[PDB]
Amino acid sequence: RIRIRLKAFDHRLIDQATAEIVETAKRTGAQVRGPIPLPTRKERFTVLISPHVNKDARDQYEIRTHLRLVDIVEPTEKTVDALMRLDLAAGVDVQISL
Amino acid sequence: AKQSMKAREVKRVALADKYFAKRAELKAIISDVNARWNAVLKLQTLPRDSSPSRQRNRCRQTGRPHGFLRKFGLSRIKVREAAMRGEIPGLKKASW
Amino acid sequence: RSLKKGPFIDLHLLKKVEKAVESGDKKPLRTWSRRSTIFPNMIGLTIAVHNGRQHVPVFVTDEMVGHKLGEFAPTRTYR
Amino acid sequence: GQKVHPNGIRLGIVKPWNSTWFANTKEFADNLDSDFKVRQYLTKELAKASVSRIVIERPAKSIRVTIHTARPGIVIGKKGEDVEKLRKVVADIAGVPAQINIAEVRKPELDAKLVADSITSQLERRVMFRRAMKRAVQNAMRLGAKGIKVEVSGRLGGAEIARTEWYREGRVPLHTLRADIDYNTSEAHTTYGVIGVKVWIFKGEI
Amino acid sequence: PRRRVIGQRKILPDPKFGSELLAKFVNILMVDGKKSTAESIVYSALETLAQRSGKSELEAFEVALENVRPTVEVKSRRVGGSTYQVPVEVRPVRRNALAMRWIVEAARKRGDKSMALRLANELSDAAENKGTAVKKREDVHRMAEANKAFA
Amino acid sequence: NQYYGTGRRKSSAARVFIKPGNGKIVINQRSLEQYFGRETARMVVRQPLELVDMVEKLDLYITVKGGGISGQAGAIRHGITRALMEYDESLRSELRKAGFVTRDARQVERKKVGLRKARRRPQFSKR
RNA sequence: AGAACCUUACCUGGUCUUGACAUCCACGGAAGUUUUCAGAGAUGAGAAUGUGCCUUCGGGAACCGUGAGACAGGUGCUGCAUGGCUGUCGUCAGCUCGUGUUGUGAAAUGUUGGGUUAAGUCCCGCAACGAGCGCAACCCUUAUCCUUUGUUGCCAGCGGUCCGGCCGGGAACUCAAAGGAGACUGCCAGUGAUAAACUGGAGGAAGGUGGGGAUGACGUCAAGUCAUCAUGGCCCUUACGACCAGGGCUACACACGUGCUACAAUGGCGCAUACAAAGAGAAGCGACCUCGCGAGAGCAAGCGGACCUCAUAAAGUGCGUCGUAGUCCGGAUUGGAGUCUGCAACUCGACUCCAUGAAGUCGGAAUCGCUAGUAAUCGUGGAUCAGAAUGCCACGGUGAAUACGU
């Protein structure tokens, strides 16, 4: 319906983007349950630090994938207007699907 | 990093769409328990360098044939050189 | 053991085997490919298997059909 | 020479980004190719322009590339004379609709890459490294920069043996995570050898 | 253990009988960190001990272990370019510690069927002494008294 | 109203409930003897109920997941002590001495580079 | 972080020499998708169609063939010319600069002392007064609570029930990720120059840098890396380049290291049964279902993923059997017969079936690690990758012994 799901890399990026979408929706419309935090998948990589030998020292790498789910419960024609194209995208992949 | 073997990659990768991929639909359903005729396996006189897992997957910048990661598409050294200069979003010092 | 249904061989050597039947056998055929298995039609014929120096004159026999061409030519020189 | 790189260590703590974009693991590998490929050509065309640093992003099947510079006049030019040809080739390499931004870097002596490129470019002139390094030192506390230090390594003054002979002034806390540290590595293209220029700059505590 | 002196952390008591002495005992026998298979041997040994001898549960192994308590032990010096063994009185914490070890180590040397049985055999011969632990308890005893000089 | 307590022990999280009724044990819709707790850590679930006047005092419903046999048992051990809030923090004063309200900070150690599992440095050749 | 071709450099052969790859000149040809014959292949020699976006006619940009020199190429040489990166002493607590002073000067002082700390930590003292690197702190994760949010997560009070959180519902709770509180020798007691600090107690989930990671000073070993890359110089250049096929890197009278698997009744075997965490997955992971003893095969949902798939975790536990033997220990080696990935499994594989069942019964001098959720032991996942882990990285289960002392 309005089943939204995004993904951001930094510990706090979406928190302001998924904040502004709430008061855009709940002010003009109604309901709007709010941003569900969801589990963060963290893809951990480990590779050899030196070009030759030196396996005993390695630098560990990680990429955190932070999810959010808004889910506006009120699909009014007033609230769907003046909401889209206020995303001001900082990279984050917006997706609207079941 | 030995531009010949890197040029040999450009040949090897570019052959994968012509001789195989499309025409490698042959041998998939064809070489199977059906109905035999052995003329299907006589189509394997093709140049061979198109093979689906023939590339070493050298690093995209340098061309090291070692420490390649499928995620970044680069070698561990060029991962670290880049990683310390940022460039990979969400990448930092891992500790937990 | 391996190779599932059907014994795998190369195309160029299959023509060489059929050449020895149709045109008739003459001398040991010098072949670089070691991938092709021996067949019943290859019994009686002469071939030569390359292995990093020169083609070794290997003779085909009844019970050699089960094994490969490259088994009869050891690559690594010892002693 | 065993040290953590000041930028990378401070990415999690106190930097915005060197790449603000988001992407998925499937297209990530070919996406990272285009990020270094554009910068390879961009550094060539902005060689005389004195580029400090640029930040790539891809907002939903597009590409921005926010470019900074010490000299905005050489990058911008008359109207959109210089920017139109830059933005054209960025769209061709990326294979997508390309935007572009401009950002004037006040006080070019406060950036790492600008000072590193300024000091290393003087090596092709064949001047004294002691003075060339001291020219960056002489104006440290004058305009900004609560601390700053410069290192060179190997082939000093066309010598046979290779020394280091680094130099430092002010306060440069290399292991204080909250401390703002600007750093970038650069190399020389001189006929007498390759000297690497490392410059650590300290702006403030928070 | 040069600067830092530990607080000697206390293990929990035996879950059936409640004896903190047997909590250390099961842990000596415990190999591969298996407490469940360790105690199963311990109880099966202790049940066969008190049944055969016809004594009570807690004081069967205690009076048994009291016979295998070492009086004194020795410590190697290495000071003036020679090995000197100096005899010292083992404290009650270390007294039963070596006792439980040498019972389990003596039962380990036996060639009998089960661990419950072979351990119980050494517990059975603890009160009246023919076995290997009761031989092992006074090994240094002969070396001691000869080293009464160094004190 | 119900008398709730959480508790946990080495990534094993329990959810304890207490009431005034009968002393039948119900864990994950299963009995205490049918909760397989026969060997050491048999009565660590009722370790916080060792030194109390009970006979057959309270209903108890508990539910633990995560970790193993002993970790889940210590989650029930620490969980019941939080559920003693029916008697507020008056009975805690004696329970502080026992150290059952004390939550175990000991967690399994991470695997480290050049080490077999968290500590063991792999042996080197002679000198 | 993975030599069956490829990789791959090295070898034996077959070939090419402005070249496989990049810029420039001239010249003809759209590129290219079609096929045949010969050769192991690199490849040369034919027959097809096509001839496309700009052109006062000399042409363009893509790409292809030819020829010409400038060059291109070099995993070749020098880590005793270097950049970059890194091991190690060492996560040891040190190492220096300013002025000032001391000495004729090298230097010293500072940073010599007395206490104290994990620590050049802090205190007092001081011919030095200050600063800076390093330590500490700031970061991440974990121990606890509060607030924000309630699906795919979760199920307590309620009814409906096919006894399945499954369907209303319920928002508590666990779980989940955002922001906060909480641990500072401070509250108290004793000692201590009355200072720092120390020892103990109270509170608290967590007390004396809480636990772990990240974090590695000035420098040493002309330590490693010209082989990832970059690069000075040198050298080869119809060859030390380039392409192809097969071979080698996997050899076998030897020596050592690093591991797995054992020698077993804390155990083997068979049946039944309970309890995890962290991941991965669209050129993918594969239910359920059917076939085969099995490796897998055919059919074939859902899920770009708290949903669906890999995934039925093992130790453990309940019975039975085995009862001290080279054995129901142990699994090697070898034979016969299969599957899978892939042009391809002989050199040179993984895995399955049947059969064979070496050595080995706790191992010589000596030697390696570890102080608590650790040693030990038992499983799982990932990266690499078409396909090959006992390695490596990551995760959890159960879980000790002993620290008198330098």
**Nucleic acid strand G: bases within 7 A of protein CB:** 1-2, 5-9, 11-12, 20-21, 33-34, 39-42, 72-75, 81-88, 118, 131-145, 148-152, 155-157, 172-179, 200, 203-207, 210-219, 222-225, 227-233, 241-249, 251-252, 256-259, 265-267, 274-283, 297-298, 304-306, 313-318, 323-324, 337-347, 349-350, 367-378, 383-386, 392-406
Closest nt to residue A49, judged CA to C1': G86
Domains of chain B, residue spans: 1-86
Q: Which residues of A20-35 are buried (b: 16+ CB within 10 A; e: fewer)?
A: ebeebbbeebeebeeb
A60 CB neighbours in chain F (<8 A) are 113
**Would you say E134 and E126 are in contact if contact means Cβ atoms under 8 Å apart?**
yes
Cα separation, D140 vs D146, in Å, equals 7
Q: Does A91 contact D57 at a Cβ distance shorter than 8 Å?
A: yes
Is-contact C33 C50, C-beta < 8 A?
no
- Domains and their CATH numbers in chain E: 20-147 (1.10.455.10)
Q: What is the DSSP string of B22-85?
A: IGGGTTTSSSSS-----TTGGGGGS-STT-TT------SSS--SSSEETTTTEEHHHHHHHHHT
* Strand pairing report for F59-62 and F25-27: parallel
| Cβ pair D54, D39 in contact under 8 A | yes
CA C36 centroid distance within chain = 7
Q: Among all strands, which nt has the closest C1' to C13 (CA)?
A: G40
DSSP three-state, residue D64: coil
Using alpha carbons, list the distances in angstroms from residue B55 to A77, B6, B58, F121.
54, 11, 8, 37
Resolution (A): 4.6
Report the gap between the CA of A60 and the closest CA in chain D (Å). Answer: 12
C-beta pairs of A23-30 under 8 Å, 24+ apart in sequence: A24/A82, A24/A83, A24/A86, A25/A70, A25/A72, A25/A74, A25/A79, A25/A83, A28/A78, A28/A79, A28/A82, A28/A83, A29/A72, A29/A74, A29/A76, A29/A78, A29/A79, A30/A74, A30/A76
Q: How far is B45 from chain C (nearest CA, A)?
A: 7
Q: Where is F60: in which H helix or E strand?
A: strand F59-62
State the Cα–Cα distance between residues E46 and E62, nearest whole angstrom: 11
Nearest CA in chain D to A95: D60
- Looking at the DSSP bridge assignments, the partners of residue D198 are D151, D185
Place of tokens 């419309």: A29
What is the C-alpha separation between D50 and D33, in angstroms, rounded? 24
CB contact under 8 A, F40 and E40: no
Nearest CA to B59 out of D33, C70, D126 is that of D33
Which helix (H) or strand (E) covers residue A25, if one does?
Answer: helix A14-28
What D51-55 contacts at long range (C-beta under 8 Å, 24+ apart), as own/partner pairs, is: D51/D75, D51/D113, D52/D105, D52/D108, D52/D111, D52/D113, D52/D114, D53/D18, D53/D111, D53/D113, D53/D184, D55/D17, D55/D18, D55/D19, D55/D20
Contact A61 B90 (CB under 8 A): no
Q: How far apart are alpha carbons D98 and D205 in whole angstroms?
A: 37
Amino acid at F101: V
Cα(D12)–Cα(D14) distance, integer angstroms: 6
**What sections of chain C are H helices per DSSP?**
11-22
A59 to chain F: closest CA residue: F113
Q: Which residues, in sequence order, are bridge partners of residue C59?
A: C46
Q: Yes or no: say if D37 and D93 are a contact pair by the CB < 8 Å rule.
A: yes
| B42 touching chain C per CB within 8 A | yes
Which amino acid, E140? V
- Determination technique for this entry: cryo-EM
Q: What is the DSSP letter of F110?
A: P
Q: Using a CB cutoff of 8 Å and minimum separation of 24, what contacts does E94-97 make?
A: E95/E69, E95/E70, E96/E21, E96/E24, E96/E65, E96/E69, E97/E24
Residue nearest to nucleotide G345 (CA to C1'): C2
Helix locations, chain F, DSSP H: 69-83, 92-98
Residues 6+ apart with CB under 8 A from C25: C44, C45, C46
Nearest to F42 among E15, E26, E40 (CB): E15
Cα within 13 Å of Cα(E90), Cβ side: 20
* B-A interface (Cβ pairs under 8 Å ≥ 3): yes
Measured N-to-C along each axis, helices E92-109 and E115-124 cross at an angle, to the nearest 10 degrees, of 120
Spatial distance between the Cα atoms of D95 and D101, rounded to a whole number of angstroms: 19
What does the alpha-carbon distance between residue D25 and residue B73 come to, in Å, rounded to a whole number? 10
Q: Which chains pack against F, by 3+ Cβ pairs within 8 A?
A: A, E
Stated in angstroms, how far is C28 CA from G6 C1'? 31
* C9-28 residues touching B, CB cutoff 8 A: 11-12, 14
**Contact D102/D76 with Cβ under 8 angstroms?**
yes
Of D183, D191, D46, D38, nearest to D116 (Cα)?
Answer: D183
**C6 with B45: Cβ contact below 8 A:** no
Residues, chain B: 96
Distance CA C4, CA E102 (A): 62
CB atoms inside a 10 Å sphere around CB F15: 18
C-beta separation of F28 from F68 below 8 A: no
Taking the alpha carbons at both ends of chain D, their separation in whole angstroms is: 28
Rounded to the nearest angstrom, the gap between the alpha carbon of residue E133 and the centroid of all alpha carbons in its chain is 9
Backbone angles phi, psi at E124, to 5 degrees: -65, -45
DSSP state of F49: T
Cα angle value F41/F46/F50 (rounded, 5°) = 115
Task: Give dist(CA D168, CA D158) in Å, integer.
Answer: 23
Q: String of b and e for D186-195 (b: at least 16 CB within 10 Å)?
A: bebeeeeeeb
Q: In Å, how far is E37's CA from the nearest CA of chain F?
A: 9
Helix H or strand E segment including D152: strand D147-153
User: Residue A89 and residue D58: Cβ atoms within 8 Å?
Assistant: no
DSSP 8-state secondary structure symbol assigned to residue F15: -
Question: DSSP string spanning A43-60?
Answer: EEEEEESSSSS-TTSEEE
Determine the Cα–Cα distance for residues C54 and C75; give it in Å rounded to an integer. 11
Whole-Å CA distances, E22 to E9, E11, E59? 16, 11, 12
With tokens 């300290």, the residue in question is: D202
Range of the domain at F104: 1-127
Residues 6+ apart with CB under 8 A from A30: A74, A76
Which amino acid is residue A52, in one-letter code?
A: H
Residue D101: beta bridge partners?
A: D66
On chain B, the residues whose CB falls within 8 A of the CB of A47 are: 67, 69, 76, 79-80
Neighboring chain B residues of D43 at a CB cutoff of 8 Å: none
Does A90 sit within 8 Å of D20, measured CB to CB? yes
Strand spans (E) along E29-151: 72-76, 85-89
Q: Which two tokens stand for residue E74?
A: 């020795």
Would you call E49 exposed, middle or buried from its count of C-beta atoms within 10 A (0-12, 13-18, 19+)? buried
Helices (H) and strands (E) in chain C — how many of each? 1, 3
Q: Rounded CA gap, D190 and A12, in Å? A: 45
Q: Distance between CA atoms of E126 and B20, rounded to whole angstroms?
A: 81
Report how far residue B57's alpha carbon sits from residue B66's, in angstroms, rounded to the nearest whole number. Answer: 9
Closest nucleotide C1' to the C-alpha of A70: G149
Q: How far apart are CA A26 and CA A35, in angstroms?
A: 12
Q: What's the CA gap between E47 and E25, in Å, rounded?
A: 15
Q: For residue D168, which phi and psi values (nearest 5 degrees)?
A: -150, 145
Do residues E147 and E85 lie in contact, with contact meaning Cβ atoms separated by under 8 Å?
Answer: yes
CA torsion angle for E108, E111, E112, E113 (degrees, to 10)? 90
Of D169, D176, D175, D170, which is closest to residue D205 (Cα–Cα)?
A: D176
Instruction: Determine, for residues D18 and B73 on separate chains, whether the beta-carbon distance falls below 8 Å.
Output: no
Give the angle subtended at the CA of F38 by the CAs of F35 and F44, to the nearest 5°.
80
Cβ within 8 Å of residue E48, ≥6 positions away: E116, E117, E120
Phi, psi of D93 (to 5 degrees): -70, -45
Q: Which residues of D touch B91 (CB under 8 A)?
A: 11
- Chains near A, with 3+ CB pairs < 8 A? B, D, F
Q: Among F1, F58, F63, F54, which Cα is nearest to F29's? A: F63
φ, ψ for residue F72, nearest 5 deg: -65, -35
- Asked whether the beta carbons of residue C11 and residue B42 sit closer than 8 angstroms, the reply is yes
Residue that the structure tokens 């002034």 belong to: D169
In contact, D69 and D105? CB cutoff 8 Å? yes
Name which of D93, D92, D73 is nearest D83 in CA terms: D73
Give A19's contacts (C-beta < 8 A, 6+ positions apart): A35
**Beta-bridge partner residues of A47:** A59
E9, E36, E41, E42: which to substitute to probe chain F, counting the most F Cβ within 10 Å?
Answer: E36
Where along chain D do its domains lie?
A: 16-106, 107-206
Q: What angle do CA C31, C35, C38 make, to 5 degrees?
A: 80
- Beta-strand relationship, D66-69 and C56-59: unpaired
Residues of D in contact with A92 (CB under 8 A): 22
Dihedral sign, Cα of residue B30, residue B31, residue B37, residue B38: positive
DSSP character at residue B19: I
CA–CA distance from A79 to each of A25, A69, A82 (Å)?
A: 6, 18, 7
